[PDB]
Design a protein around this ligand. Structure first.
Ligand SMILES: [Mg+2]
Ligand SMILES: [Zn+2]
Lengths: 303, 69, 119, 359, 124
């Protein structure tokens, strides 16, 4: 109360319900408040960023929760890392936090001028699975119900599927284009999937080895680390930032992340011990290669 | 400290047969003879516990505090 | 952590109720009591909640006692023991409960909170 | 006419006393020469002409969204005396007792545990030591007597006086979990032989789940403790209760729908621009069961829908269902009401078939 | 939480029983571990432990997996096949939230896990 110049606890207010104009109320943090999020050591300019608070009303949760794609700002992982969080309470510090220190300002690295954020891990491999031309089940198609279900969690305005029958089939490139059309960009680059070391073996699909986007329509190629990966200069999120703003890129990273995650929700992705196992014929081939290296070492000894 | 009342994973009540299983396993090991390498596949089946990876894992691996203390 | 845990008074010591022998044991477990559980684990992507070394856990597995246990803290103070009388007033701790005190101490079995006074 | 719920196999899990070691152990421990009063029963149900959303919703409800009973200790019921065992803490024993599966008609039963080890070695407390002092005397036991509640060191006691029957659902605490999953398959999708190296990395089904719409399902659920002489009645009651729980939740959502002419916090309607109306329904503490059912039946009722989808974010603890359709608010509400009526009819048919089949 | 291969992990999701994925036999995980946690750190001992423990649980045995003991992952996978499972430890699995099966068979099995005594209530 500024008339008394005194601070009063909320429990001791007998008839102080006259919260009069000019006095300062200290209220709880609500969803939508901005907070400074800091991981130490603070080495980068993005080691402190301002995030919009989402209050987790579950009393059993006591962790700071963040999107996995926001970890690139702090060089953080979830193996036990701790980060400091303070909510600006002053008006000047809150205006500053919103306008200046928001993490949309650190989407492009000051150090390298490239984008910092992008898809990581599941969203990188889930974007490839979504946008690949063929699956082991045949063509990489989904029906209208599953195409709609990919956009359930994007938190954006969902596209229109009214022109699709229930039995109509949609490609993963078609549903991706439904999202990228909101921020149309032009991209043409080879994917990380296509590489010359792998090329002599494996059948590379022609539709997969050249990623092309025209006005937000992905027409060929897969989306992987080259296009959607974090720190990929010239990727789709760097382009969205250049044309529409770093805040749009952050919203597009989240939306494409949801599409990739909702796709693997049906595709499934796993690793097995048999994934690392050579066939008995290939194990003999590897043994013969090493015997060649040992003989070459042995001849050097004889010299 | 004991075999759990239910399977930790699925909630099937393995503690219904925990005591019978412990005693019967001790006897069946004592006839056979590592001790842990003797197969309890048929012993667990007789108790009515199904071929569930989770239920048979927690049944045969849970440490009994009375055995160590 | 210590088979004499209830007799001992410990600080920051966690006693886990349930322990399992590993299904794939090693020679070390012949000499140290196995601590941990043979959890069923699926190596899979499930909604992106286990990324960057995170894990999705079964809530039922938590409720059923998996990795549950008791954490202990010791409060030792040295000298008289007794609940302060209202005559002290001024020197009393601000906002402290000062209740739940019998014979100068909190009774065994009482749930204490941040505002409570113990000993 | 067709029966949605087709044949069912009900097979209890029984102890095999043909095993010498099992018979000897049961005789030496509990003097048990026969089956326990309550046995786990594996129920394998076949469903035809029904969506996967309805069958999986039934499975989810029977797992952890059906009201269920468990034994809990009232505050102050764990008597701390000088002779209490120091290893059987209230937390450990309460966890043991909570997860004893009970089959209780009556909620007004209170049990007591009064165990004292006067002998020179460790005495194990069994579930038979839970003596009942409250309510009507149990003609049939509600739990098996073979559970190991704990063990007492020599000279130690354990008194637990207020062991009452608590009600709840399993998604709030797993002690209320009812059914465990033993099988789920679709009978109208062909399967590869997955022992082949070429197919061992795939699920087995010859249709991608992103395009398949299976209507013939096999659902196998195990119930942990039903009385041995009354297996079929218990299974019937479980299935009917699940169906009526689903119907009741759907009818709550039906009430929100019908009250649309008056503003409600849980239902928001817009007319966006192109004759499209956006309906957003938000129900707190609603799970994927109802959301999936609603999305599936709205989609089946409006195949040309602009968009239908739900999100159950693990935080915010709510179900948010968004319907966008090229129709007016009243016409959209009519279609949504008719889809809800379709859901209710499906589950009422399921309940009738449950009565018809198990009998 | 950590496994015996040193792969630490922070638990951030508690799903109910009905929300967890389950196999065609109803086996569901206690922990869901990202496959992306394997390839970089090369914790293949955890994979082999899961493979062996899948057959250990079905045979009702506990086996010695000490380091430098002879290892043949091909024979362990053949043992998995002999126990009635696939050559890999992968099973047909269904999404718990929707009931839809994953197109890929999911590698699921018993891996010994430990609770590291760093508690979030102590840290926060
Ligand atoms: Mg770290
Ligand atoms: Zn189990």
């Amino acid at each position: 109360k500024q008339i008394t110049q005194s601070v009063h606890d909320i429990e001791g207010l007998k008839q102080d319900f006259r919260l009069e104009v000019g006095d300062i109320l200290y209220r709880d943090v609500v969803t939508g408040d901005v907070a400074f999020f800091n991981r130490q050591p603070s080495l980068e300019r993005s080691s402190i960023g301002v995030h919009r608070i989402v209050v987790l009303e579950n009393p059993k949760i006591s962790t700071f929760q963040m999107n996995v794609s926001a970890c690139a700002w702090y060089n953080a992982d979830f193996d036990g890392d701790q980060m400091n969080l303070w909510v600006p309470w002053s008006v000047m510090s809150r205006v500053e936090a919103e306008l200046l220190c928001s993490v949309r300002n650190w989407f492009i690295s000051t150090k390298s001028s490239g984008p910092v954020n992008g898809q990581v891990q599941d969203s990188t491999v889930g974007s490839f699975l979504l946008t690949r031309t063929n699956t082991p089940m045949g063509k990489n198609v989904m029906n209208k119900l599953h195409a709609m279900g990919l956009f359930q969690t994007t938190q954006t305005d969902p596209p229109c599927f009214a022109n699709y029958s229930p039995t109509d089939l949609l490609d993963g490139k078609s549903v991706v284009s439904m999202l990228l059309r909101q921020t149309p960009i032009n991209y043409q680059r080879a994917p990380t999937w296509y590489s010359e070391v792998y090329a002599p073996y494996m059948h590379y699909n022609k539709q997969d080895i050249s990623t092309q986007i025209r006005n937000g329509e992905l027409i060929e190629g897969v989306l992987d680390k080259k296009a959607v990966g974090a720190g990929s200069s010239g990727g789709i999120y760097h382009l969205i930032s250049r044309r529409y703003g770093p805040q749009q890129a952050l919203k597009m990273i989240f939306a494409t992340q949801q599409l990739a995650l909702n796709y693997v929700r049906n595709a499934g992705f796993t690793v097995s011990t048999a994934d690392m196992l050579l066939t008995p014929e290939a194990h003999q081939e590897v043994q013969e290669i090493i015997n060649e290296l040992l003989l070459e070492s042995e001849e050097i000894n004889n010299r | 400290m004991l075999i759990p009342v239910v399977c930790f994973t699925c909630g099937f009540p393995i503690g219904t047969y925990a005591a019978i299983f412990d005693k019967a396993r001790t006897e069946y090991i004592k006839t056979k003879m590592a001790s842990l390498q003797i197969e309890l596949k048929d012993l667990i089946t007789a108790l009515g516990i199904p071929m569930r990876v989770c239920c048979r894992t927690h049944l045969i691996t849970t440490l009994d505090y009375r055995k160590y203390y | 952590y210590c088979f004499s845990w209830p007799y001992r008074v410990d600080m920051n010591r966690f006693f886990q109720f349930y322990n399992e022998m590993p299904l794939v044991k090693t020679i070390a477990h012949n000499y140290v009591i196995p601590n941990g559980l043979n959890t069923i684990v699926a190596y899979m992507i499930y909604g992106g909640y286990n990324q960057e070394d995170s894990v999705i856990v079964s809530q039922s597995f938590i409720d059923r006692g998996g990795f549950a246990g008791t954490f202990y803290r010791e409060e030792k103070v040295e000298l008289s023991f007794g609940k302060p009388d209202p005559l002290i007033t001024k020197n009393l701790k601000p906002g402290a409960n000062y209740e739940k005190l019998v014979d100068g101490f909190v009774p065994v079995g009482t749930v204490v909170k941040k505002g409570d006074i113990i000993i | 006419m067709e029966k949605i719920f087709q044949n069912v196999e009900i097979k209890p899990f029984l102890i095999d006393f043909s095993n010498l070691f099992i018979k000897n152990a049961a005789k030496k421990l509990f003097q048990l020469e026969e089956q326990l009063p309550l046995v786990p029963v594996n129920v394998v149900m076949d469903f035809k002409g029904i969506s996967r959303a309805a069958v999986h919703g039934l499975s989810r409800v029977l797992q952890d969204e059906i009201p269920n009973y468990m034994l809990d200790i009232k505050p102050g019921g764990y008597k701390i005396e000088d002779s209490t065992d120091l290893f059987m803490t209230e937390q450990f024993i309460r966890n043991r007792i909570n997860f004893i599966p009970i089959y209780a008609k009556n909620e007004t039963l209170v049990f007591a545990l009064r165990s004292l080890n006067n002998s020179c070695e460790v005495k194990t407390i069994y579930s038979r030591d839970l003596i009942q002092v409250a309510g009507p005397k149990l003609k049939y036991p509600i739990f098996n007597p073979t559970f190991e509640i704990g063990f007492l060191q020599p000279g130690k006691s354990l008194i637990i006086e207020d062991i009452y029957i608590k009600k709840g659902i399993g998604r709030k605490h797993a002690a209320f979990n009812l059914a465990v999953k033993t099988h789920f398959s679709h009978l109208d999708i062909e399967q590869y032989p997955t022992d082949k190296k070429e197919y061992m990395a795939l699920s087995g089904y010859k249709q991608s789940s992103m395009t398949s719409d299976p209507r013939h399902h096999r659902l196998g659920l195990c119930f942990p403790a039903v009385p041995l002489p009354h297996i079929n009645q218990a299974v019937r009651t479980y299935l009917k209760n699940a169906c009526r729980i689903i119907i009741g939740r759907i009818q709550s959502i039906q009430k929100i729908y019908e009250n649309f002419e008056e503003p409600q916090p849980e239902l928001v309607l817009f007319s966006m621009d192109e004759e499209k109306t956006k309906a957003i329904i938000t129900i707190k503490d609603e799970t994927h069961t109802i959301g999936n059912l609603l999305k599936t039946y709205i989609y089946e009722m409006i195949p040309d829908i602009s968009f239908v989808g739900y999100q159950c974010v693990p935080h915010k603890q709510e179900m948010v269902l968004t319907i966008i359709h090229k129709a007016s608010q009243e016409d959209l509400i009519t279609l949504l009401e008719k889809s809800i009526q379709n859901i209710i009819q499906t589950f009422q048919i399921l309940e009738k078939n449950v009565d018809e089949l198990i009998a | 939480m950590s496994s015996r291969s040193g792969n630490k992990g922070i638990a951030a999701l508690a799903l109910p029983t009905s929300d967890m994925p389950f196999t065609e036999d109803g086996l569901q995980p206690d922990l869901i571990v990202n496959p992306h946690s394997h390839p970089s750190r090369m914790t293949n001992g955890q994979m082999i432990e899961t493979t062996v423990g899948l057959a250990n649980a079905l045979q009702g045995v506990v086996t010695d997996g000490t380091a430098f003991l002879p290892i043949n992952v091909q024979l362990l996978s053949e043992r998995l096949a002999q126990e009635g499972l696939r050559f890999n430890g992968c099973q047909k699995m269904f999404n718990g939230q929707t009931g839809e099966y994953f197109d890929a068979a999911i590698f699921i099995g018993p891996t010994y896990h430990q609770r590291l005594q760093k508690f979030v209530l102590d840290d926060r």
